[PDB]
Amino acid sequence: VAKAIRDGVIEASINHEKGYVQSKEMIDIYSTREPQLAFHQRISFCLDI
Amino acid sequence: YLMEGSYNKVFLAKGNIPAESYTFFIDILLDTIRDEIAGCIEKAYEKILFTEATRILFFNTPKKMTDYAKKRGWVLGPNNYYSFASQQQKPEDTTIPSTELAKQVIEYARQLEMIV
Amino acid sequence: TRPANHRQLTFEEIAKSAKITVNEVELLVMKALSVGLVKGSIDEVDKRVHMTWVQPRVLDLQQIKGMKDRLEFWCTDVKSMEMLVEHQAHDILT
Amino acid sequence: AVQKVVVHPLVLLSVVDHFNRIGKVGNQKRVVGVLLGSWQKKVLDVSNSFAVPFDEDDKDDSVWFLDHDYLENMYGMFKKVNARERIVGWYHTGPKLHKNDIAINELMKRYCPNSVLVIIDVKPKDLGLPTEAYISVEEVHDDGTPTSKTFEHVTSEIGAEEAEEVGVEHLLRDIKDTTVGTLSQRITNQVHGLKGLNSKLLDIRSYLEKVATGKLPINHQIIYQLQDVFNLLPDVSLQEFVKAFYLKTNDQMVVVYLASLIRSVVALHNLINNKIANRDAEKKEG
Known part of the structure; x- marks a missing residue:
């Protein structure tokens, strides 16, 4: 799990003394900048064709 | 075993070589595992106990633990290890987006009306 | 006194700086707003206020130098953006 | 009046x-x-x-x-x-x-x-x-x-x-x-607007220097309105503004996407028409 957290696979934390793993909540990806990149990547293609 | 986090089996096998000692390379391997685990624990969790930290890393209780902490930060507390916490510098930024978006939109309009 | 950012401020700080008990500051700020010399809003459950505009005042030859400076290193940004755009779209109408 | x-x-x-x-x-x-x-x-x-x-x-x-x-x-x-x-x-x-x-x-x-x-x-x-x-x-x-x-x-x-x-x-x-x-909507506009604004700020500084010294007949009304102008500038850095700006541009892009798609498929149909209008006519010269 630590190696998984290293590479950004999951952002969950771990209480080693206890043992349980708790994870963060990341929703509302629409406000993020990534969908604009997704749209641009294929705007380029449709303009090239 | 090394490609992912499975490391207990690595140290178990370090004592199992049917060929010869191979201490020459498994040594280097031990060092490059120690430093990597020291780097990875820096963000896994908020707090560790000093005995637990000393034991999860395979060294025992020598001054080596103290020296390893000294080499890094790892400021102690009352049987406590403080977490290094930041992870918030990057967000809430638009100016660099506000420039490269302008570049990108200009690029869209470039090859749109001129004959290509 | 405060910067243009960061000009939220708390009841107790007024109460000290006006040496009046907390319970009056609401009626004081209401009065101030009602005659239009300051504009803003209030939050009673946080005990905080958010002022946003204040009547101008006279100021002297030492203060205006800051105006001069902030105007210069504002204008530099306009010049930079012009020199950028007139290059990056050179071909679309040279 | x-x-x-x-x-x-x-x-x-x-x-x-x-x-x-x-x-x-x-x-x-x-x-x-x-x-x-x-x-x-x-x-x-x-x-x-x-x-x-x-x-x-x-x-x-x-x-x-x-x-x-x-x-x-x-x-x-x-x-x-x-x-x-x-x-x-x-x-x-x-x-x-x-x-x-x-x-x-x-x-x-x-x-x-x-x-x-x-x-x-x-x-x-x-x-x-x-x-x-x-x-x-x-x-x-x-x-x-x-x-x-x-x-x-x-x-x-x-x-x-x-x-x-x-x-x-x-x-x-x-x-x-x-x-x-x-291209006219831009070059005839934005560049000209930016140049004008720059020239206005230049004249403001030119007066302000000849008020820090020179003749300097100080006029307070100028300073009042300048205080207003400097107060008016917005803080762009606020998170709640950023989320709105993204939530708008991330919508505006979809229409450009759709329109470019339609444009491409129409041009493809035009090419098909041209080619079939050629291969069925070139054979007539034997």
């Missing part, structure tokens, strides 16, 4: 002619004349003009000569050939307004109390319009006088009539922008 003024181009050409025409006669720095026009609602429309003889000596600020009856009877002559026009103002071609000018106005105000002053710059070096419009007002202030007498600014624009526009469009054979459309 009056909210905007629209100027026809014929007065521009007339003034440009007049300036050189006087350049023949003498070493005069400036020229003056009468503006004729008409009213609709709060808007003024100005269309025709004639020059009036004028003289001034830089010996001092108080020795100048404008002729009455030339204007008096010339206006009669013009009235007798077009009844619709009334005297409605006066113009001069100085680069900036001069100290005499208010005392000039008090002369000709007798002919129309609403009279307005228009400046026409004869030598452009710049991307602002050549015209300016000024109207007189008294203004009260705490002390020094009950009222000062002051020129204040009225907004101005150039317009054109049905047939004078045909006339001007015949003449501009020599230059045009290649295409109206998004």
Whole structure:
């Protein structure tokens, strides 16, 4: 799990003394900048064709 | 075993070589595992106990633990290890987006009306 | 006194700086707003206020130098953006 | 009082002619004349003009000569050939307004109390319009006088009539922008706007230096409005603004996407039509 957290696979934390793993909540990806990149990547293609 | 986090089996096998000692390379391997685990624990969790930290890393209780902490930060507390916490510098930024978006939109309009 | 950012401020700080008990500051700020010399809003459950505009005042030859400076290193940004755009779209109408 | 003024181009050409025409006669720095026009609602429309003889000596600020009856009877002559026009103002071609000018106005105000002053710059070096419009007002202030007498600014624009526009469009054979459309929507705009704003800020600094020292007749009203201007600037860095800006652009992009897709498929159909219209016709030559 630590190696998984290293590479950004999951952002969950771990209480080693206890043992349980708790994870963060990341929703509302629409406000993020990534969908604009997704749209641009294929705007380029449709303009090239 | 090394490609992912499975490391207990690595140290178990370090004592199992049917060929010869191979201490020459498994040594280097031990060092490059120690430093990597020291780097990875820096963000896994908020707090560790000093005995637990000393034991999860395979060294025992020598001054080596103290020296390893000294080499890094790892400021102690009352049987406590403080977490290094930041992870918030990057967000809430638009100016660099506000420039490269302008570049990108200009690029869209470039090859749109001129004959290509 | 405060910067243009960061000009939220708390009841107790007024109460000290006006040496009046907390319970009056609401009626004081209401009065101030009602005659239009300051504009803003209030939050009673946080005990905080958010002022946003204040009547101008006279100021002297030492203060205006800051105006001069902030105007210069504002204008530099306009010049930079012009020199950028007139290059990056050179071909679309040279 | 009056909210905007629209100027026809014929007065521009007339003034440009007049300036050189006087350049023949003498070493005069400036020229003056009468503006004729008409009213609709709060808007003024100005269309025709004639020059009036004028003289001034830089010996001092108080020795100048404008002729009455030339204007008096010339206006009669013009009235007798077009009844619709009334005297409605006066113009001069100085680069900036001069100290005499208010005392000039008090002369000709007798002919129309609403009279307005228009400046026409004869030598452009710049991307602002050549015209300016000024109207007189008294203004009260705490002390020094009950009222000062002051020129204040009225907004101005150039317009054109049905047939004078045909006339001007015949003449501009020599230059045009290649295409109206998004490249005109930009290059004819944003760059010009940015240049104008830069020049305004430059003039602000040029005054502010000659107030930190120099003559420095400090005027507090300037400082008041400057305080307002600097207070007005928004904080862009606020998270709740950023989330809105993304939530808008991340919507606007979808329409460009869809439209570009449609454009591509139509062009593909056009190619298919061309190729089949070729392969079924080329065979006819054997």
